mmCIF file of C-alpha atoms and ligand atoms in Angstrom:
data_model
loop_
_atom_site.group_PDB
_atom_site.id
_atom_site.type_symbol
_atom_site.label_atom_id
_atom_site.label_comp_id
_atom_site.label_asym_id
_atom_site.label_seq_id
_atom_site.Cartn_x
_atom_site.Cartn_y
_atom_site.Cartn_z
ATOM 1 C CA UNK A 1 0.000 0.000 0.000
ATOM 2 C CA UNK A 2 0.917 3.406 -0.387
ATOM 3 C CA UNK A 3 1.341 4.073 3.475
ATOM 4 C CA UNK A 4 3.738 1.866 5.806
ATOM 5 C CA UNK A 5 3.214 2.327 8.721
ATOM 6 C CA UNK A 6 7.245 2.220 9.570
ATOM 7 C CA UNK A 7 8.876 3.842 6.918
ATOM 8 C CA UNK A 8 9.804 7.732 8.392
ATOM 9 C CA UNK A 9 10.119 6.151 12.029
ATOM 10 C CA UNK A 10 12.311 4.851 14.390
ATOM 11 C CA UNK A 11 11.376 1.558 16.305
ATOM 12 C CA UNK A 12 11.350 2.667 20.009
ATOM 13 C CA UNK A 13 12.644 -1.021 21.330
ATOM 14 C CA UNK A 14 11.315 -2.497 24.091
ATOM 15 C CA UNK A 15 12.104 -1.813 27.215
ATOM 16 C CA UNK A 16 10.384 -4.623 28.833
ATOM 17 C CA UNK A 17 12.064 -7.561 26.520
ATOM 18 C CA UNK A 18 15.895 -5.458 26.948
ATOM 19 C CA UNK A 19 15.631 -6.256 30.399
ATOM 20 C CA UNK A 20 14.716 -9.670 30.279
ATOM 21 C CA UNK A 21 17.824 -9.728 28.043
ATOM 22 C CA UNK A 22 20.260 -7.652 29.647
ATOM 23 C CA UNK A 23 19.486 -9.871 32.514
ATOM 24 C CA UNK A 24 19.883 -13.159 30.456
ATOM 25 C CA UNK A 25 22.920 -12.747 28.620
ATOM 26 C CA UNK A 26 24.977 -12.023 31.698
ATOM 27 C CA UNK A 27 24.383 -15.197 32.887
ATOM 28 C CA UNK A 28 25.781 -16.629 29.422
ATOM 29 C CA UNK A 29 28.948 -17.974 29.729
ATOM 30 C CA UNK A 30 30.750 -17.707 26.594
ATOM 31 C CA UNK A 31 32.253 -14.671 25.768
ATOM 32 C CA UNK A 32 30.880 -14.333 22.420
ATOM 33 C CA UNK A 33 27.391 -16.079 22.493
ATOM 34 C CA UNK A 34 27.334 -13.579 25.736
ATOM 35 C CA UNK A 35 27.629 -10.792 23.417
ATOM 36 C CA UNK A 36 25.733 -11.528 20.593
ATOM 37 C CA UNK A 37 22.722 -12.321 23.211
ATOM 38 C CA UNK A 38 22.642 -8.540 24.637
ATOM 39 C CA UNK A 39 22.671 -7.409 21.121
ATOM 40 C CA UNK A 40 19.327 -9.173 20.556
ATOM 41 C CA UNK A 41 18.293 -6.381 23.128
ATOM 42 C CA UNK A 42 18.641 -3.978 19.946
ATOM 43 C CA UNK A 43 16.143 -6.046 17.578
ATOM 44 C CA UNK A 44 12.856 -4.272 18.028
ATOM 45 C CA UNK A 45 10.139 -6.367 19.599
ATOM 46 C CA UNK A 46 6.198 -6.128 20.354
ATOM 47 C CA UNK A 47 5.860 -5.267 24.131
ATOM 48 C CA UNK A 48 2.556 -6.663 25.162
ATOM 49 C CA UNK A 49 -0.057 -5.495 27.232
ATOM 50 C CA UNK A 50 -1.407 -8.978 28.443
ATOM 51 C CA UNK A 51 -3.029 -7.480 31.591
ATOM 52 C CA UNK A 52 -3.948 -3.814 33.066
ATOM 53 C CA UNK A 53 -0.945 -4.275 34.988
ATOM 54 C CA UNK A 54 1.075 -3.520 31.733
ATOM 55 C CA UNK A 55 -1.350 -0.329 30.722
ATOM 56 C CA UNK A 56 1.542 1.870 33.622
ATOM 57 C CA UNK A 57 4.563 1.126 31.450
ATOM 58 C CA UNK A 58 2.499 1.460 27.473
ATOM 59 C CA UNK A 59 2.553 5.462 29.214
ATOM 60 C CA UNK A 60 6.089 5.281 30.277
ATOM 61 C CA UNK A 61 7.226 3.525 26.879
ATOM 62 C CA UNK A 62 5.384 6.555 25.060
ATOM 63 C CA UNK A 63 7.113 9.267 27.292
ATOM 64 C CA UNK A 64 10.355 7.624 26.635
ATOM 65 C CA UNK A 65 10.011 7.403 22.918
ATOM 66 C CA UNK A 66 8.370 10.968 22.602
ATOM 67 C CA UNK A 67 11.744 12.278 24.446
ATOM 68 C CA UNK A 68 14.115 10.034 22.788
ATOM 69 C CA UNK A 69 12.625 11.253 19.267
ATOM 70 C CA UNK A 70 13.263 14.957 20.028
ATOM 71 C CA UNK A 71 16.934 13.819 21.371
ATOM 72 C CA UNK A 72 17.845 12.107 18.277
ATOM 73 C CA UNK A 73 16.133 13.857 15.477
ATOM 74 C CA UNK A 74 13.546 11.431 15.181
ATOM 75 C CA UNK A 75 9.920 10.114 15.036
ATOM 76 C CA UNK A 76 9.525 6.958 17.050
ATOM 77 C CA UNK A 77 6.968 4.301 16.508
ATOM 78 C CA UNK A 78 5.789 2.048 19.705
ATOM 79 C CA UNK A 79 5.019 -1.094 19.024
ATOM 80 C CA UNK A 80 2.408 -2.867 21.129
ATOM 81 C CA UNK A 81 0.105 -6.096 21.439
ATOM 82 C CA UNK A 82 -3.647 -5.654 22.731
ATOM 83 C CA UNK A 83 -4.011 -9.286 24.356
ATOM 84 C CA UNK A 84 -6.764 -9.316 27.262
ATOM 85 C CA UNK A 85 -9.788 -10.723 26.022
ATOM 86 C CA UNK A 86 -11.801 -12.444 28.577
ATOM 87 C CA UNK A 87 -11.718 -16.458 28.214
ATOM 88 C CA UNK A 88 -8.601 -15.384 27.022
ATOM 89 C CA UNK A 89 -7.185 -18.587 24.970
ATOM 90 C CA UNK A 90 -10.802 -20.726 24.405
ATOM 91 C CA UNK A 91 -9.041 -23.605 22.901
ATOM 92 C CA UNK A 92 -6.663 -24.228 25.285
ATOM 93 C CA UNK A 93 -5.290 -23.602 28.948
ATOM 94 C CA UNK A 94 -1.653 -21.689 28.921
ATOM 95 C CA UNK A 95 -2.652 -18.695 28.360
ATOM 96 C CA UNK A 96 -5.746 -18.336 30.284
ATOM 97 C CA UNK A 97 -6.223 -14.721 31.624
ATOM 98 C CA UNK A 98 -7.782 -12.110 34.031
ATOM 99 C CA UNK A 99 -11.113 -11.824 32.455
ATOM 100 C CA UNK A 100 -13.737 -13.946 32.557
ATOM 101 C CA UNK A 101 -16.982 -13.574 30.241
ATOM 102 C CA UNK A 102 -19.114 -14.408 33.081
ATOM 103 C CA UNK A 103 -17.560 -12.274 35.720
ATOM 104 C CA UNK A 104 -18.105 -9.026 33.559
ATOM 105 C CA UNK A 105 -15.805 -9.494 31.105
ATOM 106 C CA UNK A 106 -16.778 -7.565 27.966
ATOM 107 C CA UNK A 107 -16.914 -4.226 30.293
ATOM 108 C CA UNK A 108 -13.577 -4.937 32.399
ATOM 109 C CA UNK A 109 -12.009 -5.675 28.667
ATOM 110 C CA UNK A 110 -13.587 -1.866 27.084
ATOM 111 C CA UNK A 111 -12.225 -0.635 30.305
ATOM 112 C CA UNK A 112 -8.782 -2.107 29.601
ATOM 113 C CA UNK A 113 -9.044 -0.466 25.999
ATOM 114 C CA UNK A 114 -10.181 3.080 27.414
ATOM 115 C CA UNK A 115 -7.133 3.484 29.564
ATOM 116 C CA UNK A 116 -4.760 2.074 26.809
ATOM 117 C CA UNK A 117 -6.247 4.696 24.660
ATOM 118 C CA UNK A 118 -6.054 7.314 27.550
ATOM 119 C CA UNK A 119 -2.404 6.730 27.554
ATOM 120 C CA UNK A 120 -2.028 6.947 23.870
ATOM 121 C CA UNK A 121 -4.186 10.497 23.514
ATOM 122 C CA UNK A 122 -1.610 11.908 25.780
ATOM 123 C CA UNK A 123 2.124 11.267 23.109
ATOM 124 C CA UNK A 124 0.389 12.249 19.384
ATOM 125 C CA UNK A 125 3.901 13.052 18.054
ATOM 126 C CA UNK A 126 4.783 9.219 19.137
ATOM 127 C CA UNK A 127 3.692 6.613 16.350
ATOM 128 C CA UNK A 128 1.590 3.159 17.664
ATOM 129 C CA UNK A 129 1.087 -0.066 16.181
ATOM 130 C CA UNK A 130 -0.629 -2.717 17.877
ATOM 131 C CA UNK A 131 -1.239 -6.208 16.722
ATOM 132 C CA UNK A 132 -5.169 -7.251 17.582
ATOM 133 C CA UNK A 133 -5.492 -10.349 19.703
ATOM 134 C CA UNK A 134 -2.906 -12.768 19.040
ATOM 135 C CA UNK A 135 -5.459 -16.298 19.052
ATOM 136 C CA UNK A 136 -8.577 -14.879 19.109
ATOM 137 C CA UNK A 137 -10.916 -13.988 15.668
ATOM 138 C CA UNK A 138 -8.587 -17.399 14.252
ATOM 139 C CA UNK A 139 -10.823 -19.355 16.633
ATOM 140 C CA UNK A 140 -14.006 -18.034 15.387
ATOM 141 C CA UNK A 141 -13.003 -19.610 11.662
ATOM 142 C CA UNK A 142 -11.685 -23.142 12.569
ATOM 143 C CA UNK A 143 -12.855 -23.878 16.590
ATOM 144 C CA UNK A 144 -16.790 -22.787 17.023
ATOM 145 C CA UNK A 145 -17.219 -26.823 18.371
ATOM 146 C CA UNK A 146 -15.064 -26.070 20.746
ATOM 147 C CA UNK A 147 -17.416 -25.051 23.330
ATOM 148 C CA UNK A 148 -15.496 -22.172 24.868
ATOM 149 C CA UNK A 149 -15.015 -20.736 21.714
ATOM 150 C CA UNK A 150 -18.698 -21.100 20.772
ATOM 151 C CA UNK A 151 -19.777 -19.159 23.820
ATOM 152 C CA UNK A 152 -16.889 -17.187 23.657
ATOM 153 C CA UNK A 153 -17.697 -15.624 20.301
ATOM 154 C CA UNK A 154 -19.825 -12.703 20.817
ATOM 155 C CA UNK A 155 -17.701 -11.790 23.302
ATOM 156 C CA UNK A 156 -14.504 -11.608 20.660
ATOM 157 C CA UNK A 157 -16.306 -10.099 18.429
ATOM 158 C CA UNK A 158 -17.880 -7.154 20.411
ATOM 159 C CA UNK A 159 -14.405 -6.539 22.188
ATOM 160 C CA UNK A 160 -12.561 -6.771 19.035
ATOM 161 C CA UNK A 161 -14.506 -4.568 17.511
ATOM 162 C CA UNK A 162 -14.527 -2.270 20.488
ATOM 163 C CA UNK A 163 -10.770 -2.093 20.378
ATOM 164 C CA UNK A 164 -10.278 -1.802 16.770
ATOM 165 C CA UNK A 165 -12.969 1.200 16.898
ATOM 166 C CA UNK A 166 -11.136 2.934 20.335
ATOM 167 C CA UNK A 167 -8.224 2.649 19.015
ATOM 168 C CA UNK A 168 -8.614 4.095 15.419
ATOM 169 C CA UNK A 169 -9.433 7.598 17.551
ATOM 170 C CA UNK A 170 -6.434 7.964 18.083
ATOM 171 C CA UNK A 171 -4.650 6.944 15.433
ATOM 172 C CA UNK A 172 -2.870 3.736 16.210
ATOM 173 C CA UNK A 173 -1.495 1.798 13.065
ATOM 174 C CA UNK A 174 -3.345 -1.967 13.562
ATOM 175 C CA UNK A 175 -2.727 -5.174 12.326
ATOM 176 C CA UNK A 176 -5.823 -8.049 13.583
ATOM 177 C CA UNK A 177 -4.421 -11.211 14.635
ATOM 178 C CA UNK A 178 -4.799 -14.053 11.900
ATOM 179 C CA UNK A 179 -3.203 -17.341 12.619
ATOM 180 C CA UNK A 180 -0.756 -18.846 10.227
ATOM 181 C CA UNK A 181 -0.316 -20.739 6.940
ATOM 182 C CA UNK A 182 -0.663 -24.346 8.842
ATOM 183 C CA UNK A 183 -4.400 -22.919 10.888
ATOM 184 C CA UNK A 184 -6.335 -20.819 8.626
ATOM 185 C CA UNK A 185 -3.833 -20.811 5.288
ATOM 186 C CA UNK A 186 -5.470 -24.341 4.597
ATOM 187 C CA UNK A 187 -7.246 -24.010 1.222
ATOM 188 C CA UNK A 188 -10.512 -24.499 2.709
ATOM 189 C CA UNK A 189 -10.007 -22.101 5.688
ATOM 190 C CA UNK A 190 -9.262 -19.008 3.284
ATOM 191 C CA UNK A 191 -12.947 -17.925 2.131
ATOM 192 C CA UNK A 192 -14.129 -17.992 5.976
ATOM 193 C CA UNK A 193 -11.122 -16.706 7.150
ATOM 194 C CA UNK A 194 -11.460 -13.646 4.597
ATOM 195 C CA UNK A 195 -15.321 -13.406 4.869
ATOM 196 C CA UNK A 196 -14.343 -12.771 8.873
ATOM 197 C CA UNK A 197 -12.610 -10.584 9.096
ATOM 198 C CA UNK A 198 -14.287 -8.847 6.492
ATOM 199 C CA UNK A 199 -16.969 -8.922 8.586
ATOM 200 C CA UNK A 200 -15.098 -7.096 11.649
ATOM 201 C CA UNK A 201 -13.667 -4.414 9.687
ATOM 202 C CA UNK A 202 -17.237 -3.884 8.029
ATOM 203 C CA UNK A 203 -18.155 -3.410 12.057
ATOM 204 C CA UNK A 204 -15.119 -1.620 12.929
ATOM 205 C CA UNK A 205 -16.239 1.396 10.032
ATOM 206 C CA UNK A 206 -13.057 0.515 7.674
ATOM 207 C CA UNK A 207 -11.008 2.532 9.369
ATOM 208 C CA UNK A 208 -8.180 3.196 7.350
ATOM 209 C CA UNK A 209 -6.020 2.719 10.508
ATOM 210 C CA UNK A 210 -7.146 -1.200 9.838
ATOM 211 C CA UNK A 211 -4.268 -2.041 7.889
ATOM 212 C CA UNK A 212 -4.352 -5.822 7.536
ATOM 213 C CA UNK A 213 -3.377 -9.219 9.196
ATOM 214 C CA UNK A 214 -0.544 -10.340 11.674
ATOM 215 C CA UNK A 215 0.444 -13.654 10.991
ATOM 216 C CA UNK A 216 2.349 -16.752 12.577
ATOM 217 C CA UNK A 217 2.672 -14.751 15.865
ATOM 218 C CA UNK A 218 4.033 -16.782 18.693
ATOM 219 C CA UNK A 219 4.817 -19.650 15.922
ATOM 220 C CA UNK A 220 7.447 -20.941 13.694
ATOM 221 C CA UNK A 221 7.167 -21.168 10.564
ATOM 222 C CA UNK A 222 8.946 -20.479 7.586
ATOM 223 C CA UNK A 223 7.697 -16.722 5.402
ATOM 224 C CA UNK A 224 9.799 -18.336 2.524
ATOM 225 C CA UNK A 225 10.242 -21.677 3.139
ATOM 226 C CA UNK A 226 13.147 -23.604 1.018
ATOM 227 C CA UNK A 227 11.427 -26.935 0.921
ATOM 228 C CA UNK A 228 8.113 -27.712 2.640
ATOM 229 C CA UNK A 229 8.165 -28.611 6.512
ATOM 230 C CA UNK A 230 7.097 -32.335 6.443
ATOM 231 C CA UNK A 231 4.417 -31.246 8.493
ATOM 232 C CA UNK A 232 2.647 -29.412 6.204
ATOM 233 C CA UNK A 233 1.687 -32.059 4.106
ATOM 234 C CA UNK A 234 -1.833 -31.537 2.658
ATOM 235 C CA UNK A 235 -1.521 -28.340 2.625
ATOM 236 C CA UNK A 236 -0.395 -26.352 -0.579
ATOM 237 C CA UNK A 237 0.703 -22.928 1.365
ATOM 238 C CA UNK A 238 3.603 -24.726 3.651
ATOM 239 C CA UNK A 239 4.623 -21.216 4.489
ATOM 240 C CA UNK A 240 3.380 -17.596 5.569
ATOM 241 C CA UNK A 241 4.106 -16.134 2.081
ATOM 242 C CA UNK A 242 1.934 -18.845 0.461
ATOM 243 C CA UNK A 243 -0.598 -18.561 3.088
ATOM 244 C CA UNK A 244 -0.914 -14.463 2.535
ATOM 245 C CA UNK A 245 -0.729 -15.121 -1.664
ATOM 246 C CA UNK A 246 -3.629 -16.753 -1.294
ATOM 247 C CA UNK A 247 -5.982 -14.650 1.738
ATOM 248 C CA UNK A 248 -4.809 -11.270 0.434
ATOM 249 C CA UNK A 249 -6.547 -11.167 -2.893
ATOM 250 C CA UNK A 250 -9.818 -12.703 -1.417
ATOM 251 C CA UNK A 251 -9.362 -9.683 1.093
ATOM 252 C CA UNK A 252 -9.172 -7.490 -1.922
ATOM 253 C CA UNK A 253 -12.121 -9.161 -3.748
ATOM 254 C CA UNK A 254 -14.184 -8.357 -0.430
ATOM 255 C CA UNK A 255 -13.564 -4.671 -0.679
ATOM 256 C CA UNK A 256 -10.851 -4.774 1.539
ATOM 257 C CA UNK A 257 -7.019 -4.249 0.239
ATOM 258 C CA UNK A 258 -5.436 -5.194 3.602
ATOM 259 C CA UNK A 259 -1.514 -5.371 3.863
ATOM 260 C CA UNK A 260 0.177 -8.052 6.409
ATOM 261 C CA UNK A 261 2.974 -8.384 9.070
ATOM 262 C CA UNK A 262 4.846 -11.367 9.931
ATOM 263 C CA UNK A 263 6.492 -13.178 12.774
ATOM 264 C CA UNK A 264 9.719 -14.093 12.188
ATOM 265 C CA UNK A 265 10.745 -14.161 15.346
ATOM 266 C CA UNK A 266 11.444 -17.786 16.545
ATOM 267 C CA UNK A 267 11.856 -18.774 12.642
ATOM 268 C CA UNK A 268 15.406 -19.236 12.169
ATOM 269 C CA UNK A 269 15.162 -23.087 12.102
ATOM 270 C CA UNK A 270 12.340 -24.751 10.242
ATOM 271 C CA UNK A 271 11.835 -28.716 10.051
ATOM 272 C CA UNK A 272 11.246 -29.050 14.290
ATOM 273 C CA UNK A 273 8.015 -30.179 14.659
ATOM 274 C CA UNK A 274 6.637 -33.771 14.793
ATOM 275 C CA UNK A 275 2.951 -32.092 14.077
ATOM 276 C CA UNK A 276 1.771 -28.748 12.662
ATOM 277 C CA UNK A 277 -0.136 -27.936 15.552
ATOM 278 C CA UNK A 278 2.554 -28.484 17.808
ATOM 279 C CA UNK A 279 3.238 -25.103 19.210
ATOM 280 C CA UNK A 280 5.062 -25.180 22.556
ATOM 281 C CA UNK A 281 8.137 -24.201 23.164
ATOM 282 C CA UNK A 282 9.204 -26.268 20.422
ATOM 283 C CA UNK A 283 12.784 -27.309 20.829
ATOM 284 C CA UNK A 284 15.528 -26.149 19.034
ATOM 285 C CA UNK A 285 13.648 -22.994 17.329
ATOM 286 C CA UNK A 286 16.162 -20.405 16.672
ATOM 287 C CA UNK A 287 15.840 -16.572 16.263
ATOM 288 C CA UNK A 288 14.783 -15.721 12.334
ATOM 289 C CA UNK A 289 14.820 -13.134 10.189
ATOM 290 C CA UNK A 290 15.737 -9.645 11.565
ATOM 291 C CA UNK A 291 12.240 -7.488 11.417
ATOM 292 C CA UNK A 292 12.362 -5.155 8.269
ATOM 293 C CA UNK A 293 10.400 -3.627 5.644
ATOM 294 C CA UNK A 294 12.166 -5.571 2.719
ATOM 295 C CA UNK A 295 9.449 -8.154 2.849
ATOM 296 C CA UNK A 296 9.718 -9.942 -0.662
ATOM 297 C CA UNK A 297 5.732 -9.425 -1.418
ATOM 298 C CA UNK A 298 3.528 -6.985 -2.391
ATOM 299 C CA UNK A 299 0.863 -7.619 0.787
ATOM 300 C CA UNK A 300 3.854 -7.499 3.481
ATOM 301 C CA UNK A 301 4.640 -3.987 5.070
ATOM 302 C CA UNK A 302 6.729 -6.035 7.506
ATOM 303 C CA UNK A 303 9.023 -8.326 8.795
ATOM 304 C CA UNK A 304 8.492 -8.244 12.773
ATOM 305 C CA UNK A 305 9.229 -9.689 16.291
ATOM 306 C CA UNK A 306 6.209 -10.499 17.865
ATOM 307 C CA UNK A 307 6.334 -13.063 19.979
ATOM 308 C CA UNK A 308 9.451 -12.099 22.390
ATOM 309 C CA UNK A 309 11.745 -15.433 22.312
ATOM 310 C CA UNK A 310 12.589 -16.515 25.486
ATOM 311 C CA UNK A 311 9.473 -16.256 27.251
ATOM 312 C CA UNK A 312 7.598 -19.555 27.554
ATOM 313 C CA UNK A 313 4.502 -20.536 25.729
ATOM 314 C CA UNK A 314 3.094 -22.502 28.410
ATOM 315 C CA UNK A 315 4.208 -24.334 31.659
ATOM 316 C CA UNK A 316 5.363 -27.907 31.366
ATOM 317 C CA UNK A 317 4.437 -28.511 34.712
ATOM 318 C CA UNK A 318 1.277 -31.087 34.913
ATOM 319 C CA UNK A 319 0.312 -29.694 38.318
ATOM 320 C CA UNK A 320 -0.434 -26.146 36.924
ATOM 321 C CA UNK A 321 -3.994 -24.772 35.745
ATOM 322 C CA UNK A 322 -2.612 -23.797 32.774
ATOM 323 C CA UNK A 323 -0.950 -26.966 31.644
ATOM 324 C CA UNK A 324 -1.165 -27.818 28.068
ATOM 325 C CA UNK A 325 -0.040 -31.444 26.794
ATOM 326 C CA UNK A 326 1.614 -30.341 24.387
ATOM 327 C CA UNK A 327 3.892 -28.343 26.065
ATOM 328 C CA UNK A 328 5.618 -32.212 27.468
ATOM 329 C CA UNK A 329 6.028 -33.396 23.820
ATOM 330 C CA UNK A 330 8.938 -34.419 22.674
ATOM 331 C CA UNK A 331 9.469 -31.447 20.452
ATOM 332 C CA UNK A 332 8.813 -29.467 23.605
ATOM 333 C CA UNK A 333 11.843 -28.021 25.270
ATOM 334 C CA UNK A 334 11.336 -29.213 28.926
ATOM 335 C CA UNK A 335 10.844 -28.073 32.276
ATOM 336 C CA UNK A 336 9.263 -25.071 30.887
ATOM 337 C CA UNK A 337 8.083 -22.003 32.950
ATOM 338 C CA UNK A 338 4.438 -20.321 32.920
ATOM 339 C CA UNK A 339 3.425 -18.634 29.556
ATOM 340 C CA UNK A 340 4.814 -15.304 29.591
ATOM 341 C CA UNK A 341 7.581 -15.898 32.090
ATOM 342 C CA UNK A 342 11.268 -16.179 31.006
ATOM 343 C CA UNK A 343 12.397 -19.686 30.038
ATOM 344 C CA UNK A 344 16.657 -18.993 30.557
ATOM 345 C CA UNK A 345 17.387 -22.019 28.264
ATOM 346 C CA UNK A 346 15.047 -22.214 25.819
ATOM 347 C CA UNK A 347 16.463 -18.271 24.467
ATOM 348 C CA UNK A 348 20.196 -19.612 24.813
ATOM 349 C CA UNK A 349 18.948 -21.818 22.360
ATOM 350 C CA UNK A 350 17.450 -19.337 20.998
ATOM 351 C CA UNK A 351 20.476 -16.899 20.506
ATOM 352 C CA UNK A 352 22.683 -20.075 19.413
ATOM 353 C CA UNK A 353 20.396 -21.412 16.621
ATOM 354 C CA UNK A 354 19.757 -17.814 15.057
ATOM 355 C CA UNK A 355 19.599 -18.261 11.700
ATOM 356 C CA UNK A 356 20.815 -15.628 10.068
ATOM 357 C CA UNK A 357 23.611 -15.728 12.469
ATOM 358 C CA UNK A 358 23.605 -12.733 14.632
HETATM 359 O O1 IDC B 1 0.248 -16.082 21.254
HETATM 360 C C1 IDC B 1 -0.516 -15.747 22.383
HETATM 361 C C2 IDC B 1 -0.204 -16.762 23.538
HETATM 362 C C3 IDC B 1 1.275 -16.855 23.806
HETATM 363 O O2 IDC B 1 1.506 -16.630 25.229
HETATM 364 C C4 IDC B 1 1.524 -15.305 25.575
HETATM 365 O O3 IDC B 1 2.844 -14.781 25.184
HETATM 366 C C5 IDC B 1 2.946 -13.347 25.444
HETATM 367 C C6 IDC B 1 4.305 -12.949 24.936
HETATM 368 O O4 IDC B 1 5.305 -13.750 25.499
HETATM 369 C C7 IDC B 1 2.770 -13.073 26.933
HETATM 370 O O5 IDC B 1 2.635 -11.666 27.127
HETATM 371 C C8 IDC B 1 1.542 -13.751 27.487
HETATM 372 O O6 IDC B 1 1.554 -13.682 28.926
HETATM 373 C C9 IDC B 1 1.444 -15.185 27.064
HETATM 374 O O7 IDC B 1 0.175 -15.716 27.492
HETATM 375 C C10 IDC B 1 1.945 -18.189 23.519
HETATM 376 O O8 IDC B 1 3.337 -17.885 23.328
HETATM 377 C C11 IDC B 1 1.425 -18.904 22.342
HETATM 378 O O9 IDC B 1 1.953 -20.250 22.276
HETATM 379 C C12 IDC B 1 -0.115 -19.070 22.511
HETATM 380 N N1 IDC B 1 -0.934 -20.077 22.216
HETATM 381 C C13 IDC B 1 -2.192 -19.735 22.582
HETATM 382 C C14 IDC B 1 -2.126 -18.460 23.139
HETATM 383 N N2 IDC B 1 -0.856 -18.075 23.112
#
């Protein structure tokens, strides 16, 4: 599209994931993977708000970046991840969250928007994009007999849309959550996937702040794979830049000319997975492509980090509410830490297995 939202800004990086970082890499031992670990501290990330108690530091990462802009010469661009919906992860447990659907939800979640977007009003010289709900509308598409999701889809939709329409009154750059080339990039997933989230920007107004789709965030695969993952089989887009070939122009056919980011983020090393769905901490991922506008297609404005590597999709620990099977499979790096907490190990790995090389 005409407008990206990065070029003519600098990527404020995160505060949040450089001191999970700072404080990793000085417990690395070698010299030299030591160094090139605190460097991953200058890779700009998604910082996300995955409970009011993040909303404090979204204002202080604004301040920052409106006062390191006017000490460098520049325009700085915040980027952020609106992930609080209430049944928070319908499909599964590691992820659950602080809002329930039955204990208010909808109105604690509008709440959580307002005083996101009460922080934003305050920094307009300060740039935001936010991704929409990492594993939420994707649900809607593929999951409705899951019964969570089923009663948990009015809910998505109305706070979705309530976000999305908040947050376009102020200006913020967004990209809506849409799964990945091995969940809705399946052939037959494409025309629902598309008619969806037609159907929420259609709700949201079209905002022109709507830019597009966020895909494979929090996942691995390849944007340009060189052979198809064996795990793909079946499925004709093996990778994200088949899987956004193929949605984009039904996008455009539906009135809607969307543009797309992508996770590269724990990509570096394809070819790790004994099933597609497999998703947890899957062992051995590496660090991938650096973010970047030089996407190699037409519908990507980005390359981008998403999913901060090194902290933990999901506990491995059987005991826990949140504990996912598949976080003990064998493709699951193991003992793992809560979902959102830093897993030490798993971004050593991480930082070893970067592909490129940092
Ligand atoms: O992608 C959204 C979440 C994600 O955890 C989420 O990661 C975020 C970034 O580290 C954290 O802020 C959250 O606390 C955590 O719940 C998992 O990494 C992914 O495997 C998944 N599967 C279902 C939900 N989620």
């Amino acid at each position: 599209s005409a407008n990206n939202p990065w070029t003519g800004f600098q990527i404020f990086l995160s505060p949040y994931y450089a001191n999970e970082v700072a404080a990793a890499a000085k417990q690395i031992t070698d010299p030299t993977l030591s160094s090139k670990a605190a460097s991953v501290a200058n890779i700009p990330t998604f910082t996300w708000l995955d409970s009011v108690a993040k909303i404090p530091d979204l204002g202080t990462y604004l301040a920052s970046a409106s006062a390191l802009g006017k000490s460098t010469g520049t325009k700085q661009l915040v980027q952020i991840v609106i992930y609080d919906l209430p049944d928070r992860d319908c499909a599964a447990k590691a992820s659950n969250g602080e809002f329930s659907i039955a204990n208010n939800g909808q109105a604690n979640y509008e709440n959580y928007i307002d005083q996101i977007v009460a922080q934003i009003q305050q920094f307009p010289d300060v740039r935001v994009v936010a991704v929409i709900e990492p594993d939420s509308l994707a649900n809607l598409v593929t999951n409705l007999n899951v019964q969570k999701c089923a009663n948990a889809k009015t809910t998505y939709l109305a706070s979705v849309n309530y976000a999305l329409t908040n947050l376009a009154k102020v200006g913020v750059y967004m990209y809506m959550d849409a799964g990945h080339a091995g969940w809705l990039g399946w052939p037959a997933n494409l025309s629902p996937a598309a008619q969806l989230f037609t159907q929420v920007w259609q709700n949201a107004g079209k905002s022109p702040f709507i830019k597009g789709l966020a895909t494979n965030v929090a996942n691995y695969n390849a944007l340009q794979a060189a052979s198809p993952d064996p795990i793909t089989q079946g499925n004709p887009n093996y990778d994200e830049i088949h899987y956004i070939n193929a949605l984009a122009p039904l996008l455009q056919q539906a009135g809607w000319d969307a543009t797309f980011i992508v996770d590269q983020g724990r990509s570096g090393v394809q070819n790790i997975r004994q099933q597609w769905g497999d998703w947890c901490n899957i062992k051995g991922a590496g660090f991938g492509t650096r973010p970047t506008t030089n996407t190699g297609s037409q519908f990507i404005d980005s390359i981008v980090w998403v999913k901060p590597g090194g902290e933990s999709d999901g506990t491995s620990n059987s005991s826990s509410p949140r504990y996912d099977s598949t976080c003990s499979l064998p493709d699951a790096a193991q003992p793992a830490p809560e979902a959102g907490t830093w897993f030490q190990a798993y971004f050593q790995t991480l930082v070893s297995a970067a592909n490129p090389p940092l």
